[PDB]
Amino acid sequence: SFVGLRVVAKWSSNGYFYSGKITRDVGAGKYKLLFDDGYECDVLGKDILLCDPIPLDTEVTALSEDEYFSAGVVKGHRKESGELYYSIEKEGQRKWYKRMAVILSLEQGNRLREQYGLG
Amino acid sequence: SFVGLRVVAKWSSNGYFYSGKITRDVGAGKYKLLFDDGYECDVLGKDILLCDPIPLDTEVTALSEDEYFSAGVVKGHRKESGELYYSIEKEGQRKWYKRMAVILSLEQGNRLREQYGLG
């Protein structure tokens, strides 16, 4: 089963994909998802990307506690006391983000679906 | 708090509103919803309608085991052994529907938002 796997899943209210973990098969093609930011939803398998980490060269969207978000490309990974960090490059310069600070726009998520979707 | 209150809330993957209960305030303007069909989601207050029953003269969408679904107008309520029934009128005639047989289209729900919305 997929219980326990890290995934990147669509929040159906805004079309973005967010990191979290599957916590149960609840049927009707859905899985209970505990997102990394604390909220839960029963999400369709079609909207789940079974993809950890998000692959190098993937076009993504980066967040911040203090500044507004934008699009760049994944260029690095790093694991530290069990937690994942990403290195994304926008317009030349590169910078680092926590796992929760990285998400996928609708368009960005759809690109990974053929290879990583549970539907 | 709103814990335990019956509501009608938007399921964002298809845009329809369905009956259920708020089960916890999870902060960030969201509420955990146990929908009457068993599925949960942490939903924004703006997508929750605090109205039980659905008021008279409300345009709704009525479900049926034997015919395709369509819009009608609430013209009655009835309580029996602890269960709510709606009297919906389409094209003149009226009929009774269990609570789970009544949902709102996206626009039908958006109409009640100003008066019954938690946001």
């Binding site: 209210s13 805004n14 973005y16 930011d37 967040l63 203090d66 507004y68 978000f69 600070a101 998400i103 | -």
Partner: peptide
């Protein structure tokens, strides 16, 4: 954190 509305 900054994010699209949710």
């Amino acid at each position: 954190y900054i994010s699209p509305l949710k």
